[PDB]
Amino acid sequence: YQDQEQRILKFLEELGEGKATTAHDLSGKLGTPKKEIARVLASLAKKGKLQKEAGTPPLWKIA
């Protein structure tokens, strides 16, 4: 998608392609609100391409 996607994509690849990340890192770099990152995360996962590790390890996942 527009820059919106180009950003999130470059974010994960900026730390490590094929890995996971945390909100503190997302809202920190992207400078976006936790409400936004949390929305797109659940919205993208709708297709099954996104993932969110909701357990012991506080962080999301990749699909």
Curated annotation (Swiss-Prot):
Where are the stretches annotated Interaction with Z-DNA? Answer: 1-63
Tree of life domain: Eukaryota
Q: Where is the signal peptide?
A: none
Q: Summarize tissue expression.
A: Ubiquitously expressed, highest levels were found in brain and lung. Isoform 5 is expressed at higher levels in astrocytomas as compared to normal brain tissue and expression increases strikingly with the severity of the tumor, being higher in the most aggressive tumors.
- Annotated coiled-coil positions are none
> What factors induce this protein?
Isoform 1 is induced by interferon alpha. Isoform 5 is constitutively expressed.
Q: Where is the Z-binding domain?
A: 1-63
What post-translational events are described?
Sumoylation reduces RNA-editing activity.
Q: What does this protein do?
A: Catalyzes the hydrolytic deamination of adenosine to inosine in double-stranded RNA (dsRNA) referred to as A-to-I RNA editing.
Question: Which disease shows up in the entry for this protein?
Answer: Dyschromatosis symmetrica hereditaria: An autosomal dominant pigmentary genodermatosis characterized by a mixture of hyperpigmented and hypopigmented macules distributed on the face and the dorsal parts of the hands and feet, that appear in infancy or early childhood. Aicardi-Goutieres syndrome 6: A form of Aicardi-Goutieres syndrome, a genetically heterogeneous disease characterized by cerebral atrophy, leukoencephalopathy, intracranial calcifications, chronic cerebrospinal fluid (CSF) lymphocytosis, increased CSF alpha-interferon, and negative serologic investigations for common prenatal infection. Clinical features as thrombocytopenia, hepatosplenomegaly and elevated hepatic transaminases along with intermittent fever may erroneously suggest an infective process.
The subunit structure is:
Homodimer. Homodimerization is essential for its catalytic activity. Isoform 5 can form heterodimers with ADARB1/ADAR2. Isoform 1 interacts with ILF2/NF45 and ILF3/NF90. Binding to ILF3/NF90 up-regulates ILF3-mediated gene expression. Isoform 1 and isoform 5 (via DRBM 3 domain) interact with TNPO1. Isoform 5 (via DRBM domains) interacts with XPO5. Isoform 1 and isoform 5 can interact with EIF2AK2/PKR and UPF1.
Its domain description in UniProt is: The third dsRNA-binding domain (DRBM 3) contains an additional N-terminal alpha-helix that is part of a bi-partite nuclear localization signal, together with the sequence immediately C-terminal to DRBM 3. The presence of DRBM 3 is important to bring together the N-terminal and the C-terminal part of the bi-partite nuclear localization signal for import mediated by TNPO1. RNA binding interferes with nuclear import. The first Z-binding domain binds Z-DNA.
The name this protein carries in UniProt is Double-stranded RNA-specific adenosine deaminase
The species this protein was found in: Homo sapiens (Human)
Q: Which gene encodes it?
A: ADAR
Whole sequence portion shown: 136 to 198 of 1226
